[PDB]
Amino acid sequence: VQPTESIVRFPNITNLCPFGEVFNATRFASVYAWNRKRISNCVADYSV
Amino acid sequence: QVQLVQSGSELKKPGASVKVSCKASGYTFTDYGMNWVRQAPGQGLEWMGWINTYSGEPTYADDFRGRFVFSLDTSVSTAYLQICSLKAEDTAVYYCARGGNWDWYFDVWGQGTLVTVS
Amino acid sequence: DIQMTQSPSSLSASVGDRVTITCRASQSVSNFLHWYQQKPGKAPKLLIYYASQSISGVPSRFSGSGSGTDFTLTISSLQPEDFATYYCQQSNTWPLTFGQGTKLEIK
Amino acid sequence: FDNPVLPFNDGVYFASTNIIRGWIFGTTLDSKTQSLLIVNNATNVVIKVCEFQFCNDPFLHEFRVYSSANNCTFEYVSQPFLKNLREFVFKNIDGYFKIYSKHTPINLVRGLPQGFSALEPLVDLPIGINITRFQTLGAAAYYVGYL
Ligand SMILES: *[C@@H]1O[C@H](CO)[C@@H](O[C@@H]2O[C@H](CO)[C@@H](O[C@@H]3O[C@H](CO)[C@@H](O)[C@H](O)[C@@H]3O)[C@H](O)[C@H]2NC(C)=O)[C@H](O)[C@H]1NC(C)=O
Ligand SMILES: *[C@@H]1O[C@H](CO)[C@@H](O)[C@H](O)[C@H]1NC(C)=O
């Protein structure tokens, strides 16, 4: 038997993922001291 | 002696196109960039973008992506900005700023271009 | 996009006292928050760069401190002739936004 | 009693018989390396990865052990849970600091029981700090193992 409709469940998460503090950053780091920032617990937009 | 002299107080129609000047002297002009901020008298400083000394690409800010145009004329030490299609909400001064690519603090120096529109 | 607020809006102080003004951040400006002041009818001048260091050639009656999202400078010896509107400036994320200002006033 | 500093290795098992109030994790400390610190006090546990300076004997007795709180990176506040033995497991894999806990009663004080208790995870701490030495905080006794 075939499925009837598709359901997608994502959480609410009332914040956009802050890629603006890692992409639009005035001081990018160096390669011996590369800045690592974990981004989590949000809804991300990869279309931009 | 390092200083950044400016143009005078401009007064034009809402829709004219005026070009303000920022003449530099004293330092290595190709070394540090030519940042520009705006300040309404009831508000604070707002950065509008900059332009590199060697290529001339006018990279604006995230808000003022439109009618602001930076114009470069090298080997005479000028940092010309031009505003076109002026609006009545742009009653603000336009401060020029020598500002480097790495340190990114200003030491902004402009005597005040009183761009009054009515 | 980065909302840079600072409190109190209008606080008064007297001659020779010690005052503390803050600058509260919404997002992370972890080290890059600079300090300016603006006299009326005057192009501004640096006070504290990189939130701890002081520029050479300023009167050192004040020092800046703080990290994270809370930043301050403390005027250890206040003088009446300033009447300056203190300005915040972050150097971390584009666009470079500023603060509204803490106007210092005499009683 | 007292509490000396211990090597962390690859992960440790902690067990005790409210004398203890928390643990201090780090590598070098004295504000040169960022150190993970846990204090369970006033029914709200606080976890700080502030770059703390340590005393010659850090102890609780306000609070004195977690002073000089500067340039902090991560902060976390949640609610804790209360003859009774409290078991803890601390590990560090893939940047995750995982905490497992289960409190079961006992009827002996000579040694650990021969029974079984499966330790549920309570909270995961996503920092990713190199940790190799640790120190914990009417004398009491406690047991430290190695994973
Ligand atoms: C990093 O900065 C960029 C550059 O500003 C941000 O990208 C988006 O860029 C476009 C133009 O390049 C701008 O869109 C604006 O949208 C409003 C409303 O639609 C419109 O009124 C404006 O005229 C302009 O077209 C804007 O700078 C920005 N879009 C936004 C913020 O929605 C980008 O968002 C920044 N962050 C990241 C994570 O890349
Ligand atoms: C999540 O969002 C939906 C609508 O998109 C809303 O109906 C629901 O109540 C939200 N869940 C919460 C607030 O827990």
Question: Which ligand has its closest atom nearest to the C-alpha of A9?
Answer: 2
What is the stated resolution of the deposited model, in angstroms? Answer: 3.7
Residues on chain C bordering chain A, Cβ-to-Cβ distance under 8 angstroms: 1, 27-28, 32, 91-94, 96
Query: What residues in D contact A42, CB-CB < 8 Å?
Result: none
Q: Can you read off the two tokens belonging to residue B10?
A: 């401009």
Ramachandran angles phi, psi of A43, nearest 5°: -105, 125
Cα of A10 vs centre of ligand 2, distance in Å, is 10
> CA-to-CA distance for D146 and B30, rounded, in angstroms?
61
The DSSP line for C65-100 is EEETTEEEEEESS--TT---EEEEEE-SBSS--B--
C96 touches chain B (CB under 8 A): yes
Residue A38 CB-half CA count within 13 A = 12
Please check whether residue B89 is in contact with residue B103, taking contact to mean a CB–CB distance below 8 angstroms: no
Cα of A13 vs centre of ligand 2, distance in Å, is 9
Please check whether residue C42 is in contact with residue C54, taking contact to mean a CB–CB distance below 8 angstroms: no
How do the domains of chain C map onto residue ranges? 4-106
Q: How many domains does chain B have?
A: 1
CA D71 vs. chain centroid, Å, equals: 21
Residue B24, classed as helix, strand or coil, is strand
By most ligand atoms within 8 Å of CB, the mutation choice from A15, A16, A19, A48 for ligand 1 is A48
Tell me the three-class secondary structure of B64-114, residue by residue: CCCCEEECCECCCCECCEEECCCCCCCCEEEEECCECCCCCCCCCCCCCCE
- How far lies B5's CA from each of B21, B25, B111, B112, D60, in Å? 8, 9, 7, 9, 62
For residue B108, what are the domain limits?
3-117
Residue B55 CB-half CA count within 13 A = 6
> CA-to-CA distance for C79 and C76, rounded, in angstroms?
10
Q: Can you read off the two tokens belonging to residue B26?
A: 């004293």
Strands D133-136 and D6-7, how do they pair? antiparallel
Tell me the three-class secondary structure of chain D, residue by residue: CCCCCEECCCEEEEEECCCCCEEEEECCCCCCCCCEEEECCCCCEEEECCCCCCCCCCCCCCCCCCCCCCCCCCEEEECCCCCEEEEEEEEEECCEEEEEEEEEECCCCCCCCCCCCCCEEEEEEECCCCCCEEEECCCCCEEEEEC
> CA-to-CA distance for B33 and C47, rounded, in angstroms?
21
Strands B36-39 and D133-136, how do they pair? unpaired
**In angstroms, what separates the C-alpha of B104 from chain A's closest C-alpha?**
8
> CA-to-CA distance for D128 and B54, rounded, in angstroms?
42
Task: Provide the CATH number for the domain around residue B34.
Answer: 2.60.40.10
What is the amino acid identity at position C52? S
Residue C49 CB-half CA count within 13 A = 12
Say if ligand 1 is within 6 A of residue A17 CB.
no
Strands B114-117 and D75-78, how do they pair? unpaired
| Proportion of chain A in helix, strand, coil states, percent, rounded to 5 | 0, 5, 95
CA angle D106, D107, D110 (to 5 degrees): 95
Residue D94 CB-half CA count within 13 A = 2
Q: Can you read off the two tokens belonging to residue D139?
A: 């004398």
- How far lies D76's CA from each of A28, B90, D49, D120, D127, in Å? 28, 45, 9, 20, 11
By most ligand atoms within 8 Å of CB, the mutation choice from A21, A24, A39, A47 for ligand 1 is A24
Does A contact C via 3+ CB–CB distances below 8 Å?
yes
Residue located via tokens 């300040």? B39
> CA-to-CA distance for D110 and B74, rounded, in angstroms?
86
Residue in A with minimal Cα distance to B102 = A27
Please check whether residue D49 is in contact with residue D25, taking contact to mean a CB–CB distance below 8 angstroms: no
Q: Which of D115, D119, D122 is nearest to D102 (CA)?
A: D119
CA of C1, closest atom in ligand 1: 31
Helix (H) or strand (E) holding B36, with range, is strand B36-39
Q: Which residues have C-beta within 8 Å of that of residue C56, sequence separation ≥ 6?
A: none
Please check whether residue C97 is in contact with residue B38, taking contact to mean a CB–CB distance below 8 angstroms: no
> CA-to-CA distance for D86 and D91, rounded, in angstroms?
17
Please check whether residue D127 is in contact with residue D140, taking contact to mean a CB–CB distance below 8 angstroms: no
- How far lies C49's CA from each of B39, C27, C89, D32, D44, in Å? 21, 19, 9, 23, 37
- Method used to solve the structure: cryo-EM
The DSSP line for C30-59 is SS-EEEEEE-TT---EEEEETTTEE-TTS-
Q: Which residues have C-beta within 8 Å of that of residue D141, sequence separation ≥ 6?
A: D1, D16, D17
Please check whether residue D123 is in contact with residue D78, taking contact to mean a CB–CB distance below 8 angstroms: yes
Q: Which of B50, B9, B22 is nearest to B110 (CA)?
A: B22
For residue C27, give the DSSP letter.
Answer: S
Say whether domain C4-106 belongs to CATH 3.20.20.70. Answer: no
Say if ligand 1 is within 6 A of residue A19 CB.
yes
Residue in A with minimal Cα distance to D95 = A38
Output b/e per residue, D111-147; b: 16+ Cβ within 10 A.
eeeeeeeeeeeeeebebebebeebbbbeeeeeeeeee
D72 touches chain C (CB under 8 A): yes
Please check whether residue C82 is in contact with residue C93, taking contact to mean a CB–CB distance below 8 angstroms: no
> CA-to-CA distance for B29 and B14, rounded, in angstroms?
34
> CA-to-CA distance for D87 and C10, rounded, in angstroms?
54
Q: Which residues have C-beta within 8 Å of that of residue B28, sequence separation ≥ 6?
A: none
Pick among C67, C69, C70, C72 to test the D interface (most D CBs inside 10 A) = C67
Q: Which of B118, B101, B99 is nearest to B109 (CA)?
A: B99
Q: Which residues are registered as beta bridge partners of B115?
A: B92
